[PDB]
Fold enoyl-CoA isomerase; Eci1p.
Amino acid sequence: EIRQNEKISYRIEGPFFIIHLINPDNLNALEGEDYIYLGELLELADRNRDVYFTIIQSSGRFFSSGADFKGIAKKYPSETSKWVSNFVARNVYVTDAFIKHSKVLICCLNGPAIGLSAALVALCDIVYSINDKVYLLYPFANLGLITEGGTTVSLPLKFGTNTTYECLMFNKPFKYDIMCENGFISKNFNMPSSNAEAFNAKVLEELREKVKGLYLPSCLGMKKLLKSNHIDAFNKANSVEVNESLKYWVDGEPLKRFRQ
Amino acid sequence: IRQNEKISYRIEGPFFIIHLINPDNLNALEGEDYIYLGELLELADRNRDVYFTIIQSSGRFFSSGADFKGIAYPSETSKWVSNFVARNVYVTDAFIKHSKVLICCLNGPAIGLSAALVALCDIVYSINDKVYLLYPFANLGLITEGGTTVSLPLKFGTNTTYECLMFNKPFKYDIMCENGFISKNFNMPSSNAEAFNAKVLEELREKVKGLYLPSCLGMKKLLKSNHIDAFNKANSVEVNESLKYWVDGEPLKRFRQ
Amino acid sequence: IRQNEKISYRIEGPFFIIHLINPDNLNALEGEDYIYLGELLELADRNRDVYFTIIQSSGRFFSSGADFKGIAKKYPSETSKWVSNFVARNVYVTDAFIKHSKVLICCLNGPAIGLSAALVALCDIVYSINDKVYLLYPFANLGLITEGGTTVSLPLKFGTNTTYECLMFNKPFKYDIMCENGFISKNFNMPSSNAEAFNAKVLEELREKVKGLYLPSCLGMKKLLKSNHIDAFNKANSVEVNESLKYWVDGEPLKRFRQ
Amino acid sequence: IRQNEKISYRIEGPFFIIHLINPDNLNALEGEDYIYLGELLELADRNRDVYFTIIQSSGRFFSSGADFKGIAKKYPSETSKWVSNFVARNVYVTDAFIKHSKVLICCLNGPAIGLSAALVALCDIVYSINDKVYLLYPFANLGLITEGGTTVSLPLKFGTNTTYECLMFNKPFKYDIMCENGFISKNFNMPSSNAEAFNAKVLEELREKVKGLYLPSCLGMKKLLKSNHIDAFNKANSVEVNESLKYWVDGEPLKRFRQ
Amino acid sequence: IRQNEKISYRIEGPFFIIHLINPDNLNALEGEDYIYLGELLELADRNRDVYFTIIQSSGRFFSSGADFKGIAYPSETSKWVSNFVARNVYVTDAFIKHSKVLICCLNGPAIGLSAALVALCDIVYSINDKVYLLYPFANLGLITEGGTTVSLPLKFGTNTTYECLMFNKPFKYDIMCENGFISKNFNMPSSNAEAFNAKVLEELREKVKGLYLPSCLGMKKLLKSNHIDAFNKANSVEVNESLKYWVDGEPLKRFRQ
Amino acid sequence: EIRQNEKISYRIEGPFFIIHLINPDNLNALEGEDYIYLGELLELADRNRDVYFTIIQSSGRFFSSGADFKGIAKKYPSETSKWVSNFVARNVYVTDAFIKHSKVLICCLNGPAIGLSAALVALCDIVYSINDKVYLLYPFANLGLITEGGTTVSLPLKFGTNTTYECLMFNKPFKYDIMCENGFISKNFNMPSSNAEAFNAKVLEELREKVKGLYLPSCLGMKKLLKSNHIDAFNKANSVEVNESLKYWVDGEPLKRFRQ
């Protein structure tokens, strides 16, 4: 059991724990407490012995525009204490929830993902794309921030070092063609951007077919070994990322910038 | 040094050539054939005249993997330690540590542990674009073997590996090419593996001309150090974590049909 | 810093631009030129106004690698000689690239070979003048082994199997292999008769691209990115340089370097 | 920086001295006091005249650890509450110690417990007032797990087997165990009725010891020394803080923290 | 779950107690007894009521190590893969990964692989100051086993380990104490291991009172991560590198006398 | 075969390759080319299949006072190039020779060792002491230098972190009692400091006894595995140590200091 969140729902169908970002009018921008909620959902899926796959789906034309900076603009003895509680807290927690998750984590990329939300996409085990207009953007250089959500590790791992530097240093998207050239996307469904619902249903339909005859505990057993390849690097990066970001918040540059 | 009717070998100058020669059973290998492969690699590795170890096969498959017939002691655990754990840790280690340049001539699909050994090779040449690697662990009620925990993400990427391993889908030729797994496709007919094998060796004889072969080995020694610890770690964990699967009985139940 | 006739530098805003300016000799570099490169990187790294270190070259080659004439040219042993002439300089220049905190951009106006190609592979971003560029690491044909962190950089940036094919058989990492691995961030598709025009267009484009950005974020992100492989590079540097010694002392490279 | 009534600081030459000044409460620290400590370390770290960061305390205890009253005291879930109150502050203060570039010296005027004892174990050098000092990590009796990098620091500085005996059974790392592991560089053998005299004698002795030394060498050496375990500490920090959450959310610690 | 006349076990509250009960042969263990030990640890590890796994022995020795009698297949390599490699990778892994707090009651000397298992325990209590650990690998024509590559430098220091291992010298009680290997010496007579074993359990029952036992396991989970990769790497390398020693024949030649 | 060096001799007796520092009048201070010679001797011992132990012995009352700074005080386009050739070169080479050596490396500590020479002592597998007056001093803080010869790794490994900081930061010796409390010394022979010859002979005498009945290839096989524990850390530290020392040499502080 868990509280309700009006921007994120979940349901369980057979071996699938399905998380749904359901705030398309605001491009599924997420506040700090929504990221914590996501982490709590993962931890709930992780403790459910009937669950073998955790599927993250979204709504409308964006997967997620990233952190809601209306919530950032909105009691603390210092700026450091403020950002330790408001930024360090939620980033380190949600990122860890994704890094350690034992169930097969699948992202249905119905549209672009930005920032911390795009970082979480990059931590999923498998990504399916609605169409060739999807992209990931990590706009840290334009926001006055640094890598978040384990992207220090995930982006070189999944897109290559040089590509990662070009994208991160100059605030350029990891476009669909770059995703495909790195095998980031396992299947493109080539559906119109206006029907994330049909896309989400189609992915689930195919997953139900693909799991037939499989010994699902083998999936988890394999994931347990595969995770060990980079678990340490991800855990190292998580604490360093959140702590090194603090000087950027406390300097004030990100507030000054994402005001406009 | 002992004889094996399913696997031969010969030495031609700096090449130690291993040949899987049981095409009628798609070069399926029993436990003791995997051990023999390990012994052959270890033999090639002690030979100071050998710089390249080339694994070639026969017929339409490179190898269909572990022989299900050979699959079918005071406990179940003891039995599987002797039968599975022993053979897998040994052969996998022989490949991981091999100091000579290890080349696979992929004359057809490779499955399971055999496909794992293909992924541990340094260089892979394909006969044609119909080759594939399949790691059917999820379908067999098993987990990663032969260092695939490390080798598959390394050589195919993490996401691609999950899609293939979680859903028992092949690493097809196109995915091999997109990841540079294959260094040359020879585009030869599958009806003649022998001609493919001869052509690869002909090409290799030409490519080695004028090179300082000790440099090849010196370079490999350093290159190997990139992932040696990860492979060694993966080897002991893979073999020990598979035990619960064998003991549970699920693979045997599935292996019959 | 001293002047070097073969390598210039200048600062344009946040950019520290190194320019190999010996096109007549395909920008082949002697030991002291590599040290000089290391010294420039270290100077760039201490300049708080610099955020990007851009390495550019001249003519039809980026660099043909180590100058063979310099190798042919007061030591009590062969070991002592090569510790001084090879080990010293490789370990220093490689370290300078590995640790550099500024964003390192290579403008590849043509082929790079050997240690120079190793340095290209240690850069963070690479732009190509056209599709005739390649990298060649001819260690097997020279009687040497991996240099300049290629032990780590080549598998990292080109894949393990591709790296073996190329290194074991002295084959180039051609443009298509570079593109298939995302090694080149942009190909400018300009004539190789005007490296200078290429060099200027890269800088024009970079001036455009940095606009609006918080440049300290670039360095903050690089600081974290560097931590992925820093240990592997440092360990590789030490081992490459020392393990190469037996090749030099045996004499095979010198026997080959004049054929 | 803001003033804190429980923690002062000052700079004497190359020394940045932090002083816990709440002896009446055995220098128990609330969440915001740990953050404040982190902030002081970070300030010390940015001061180019500082080479040593000296942490001193007052009275008969170094610190009794986290203030229980503060723990007993606007969140949509228990998880959100503890991410904010525990995870945030532990991950921040631990990181501040782990990364600190200045030589970190603890003047142990008495026992340290819990997170405070974890911070003592992250210091580079520890001096004891007398042989009655101990460190206690009471996590097993509080329903918690390792904090403040003790996952790494305790096996590193006390040995694996000793660490298990102490952590598993809630037993102190006593003075004799500290001495047997070289944890204490000097015991001053002074009365515990005058932490202040102890604190002053340490600083007197340090003024003596730094004379003649090239202080940038100290930091250069620490930079390299830190690289031995930096990855392990950073990875431990992340995991300790997140894995502790289930203990807080289950409620066992709160059930125990008022008995 | 099967019975073993040389090793019993019982569960008392949160303690899973293993008892070596063949004091007449100094608790020498054959290959299948090492496997049984592994199975017992794995059994204790699945038991949610168990927080501590306590290994106790009998008589004057904890264990004299591998049974030389049990020491005395298409090749030598295959034989030693099945007989040595299999058992060693398995038992060593069972100790390395064990999630419960692992306590050894050292009632006397431990030798060889048994001494290696003592070094993998989390906490060690000694009966008296005459206990020692001996790793006689150099004398037997073998190399490190049971993760001692890692455990001995970790727990005794690097230099001390070289002196002992290179020259076949015991890790005596004084060296154990100087390195904090022993958490308590009970100073009881060697003529009564049973009374020592009972006293340790009595003390442990008292020490656990009022503790949150899940914290013990949570802490161990994190602590284990410090060296888990090194131990796993060491396990596969140790077993595979010993093979050449067994195959050469030197250990057998020496084991007879 | 190898050139002669008037300050360092060697001989082979059975399985022992014995290196002898034989310049007691100058406390076995070593110049750059002498450190290279030491490295070459190790590499020679390493290629000799009859050799299983490499024993380093010295002469007089000091094992070695460290680097000869008459040779440092005594053609290059820059200060950097000078020190790359004169310092970086020899340190990286000799340190590597010790780190990778496959034979059991035993140091007979006949007296104090200082600086790079003391670093090499700390890289040996086994150390025997003549008496309780031996010490190791790493005077880098007083010389204006940093850790050398893998001491970044070896000193925390063999003496503990905290002890190492106290000694290195304040230029204090690792005295005999500290060595013993860390099991650094395997045996103290308790002989007068005036007879390093009798000490050196006694160690060899005991080693000849101790090796009897051993399968010597087992010693090397075990060392091969044991080395793998820290080999990467040592190799990482070697390149970083030599490169980070450069700024100290080029700044000039060490020349200014060890002038006096």
Chain D touches chain E at residues 139-146, 151-152, 155, 158-165, 167-170, 177, 180-181, 232, 235-236, 239-240, 243, 247, 252, 256 (CB under 8 Å). Residues 22 and 218 of chain D are 32 Å apart (CA to CA). Chain D has one domain: 1-259. The longest helix of chain D spans residues 78-99.
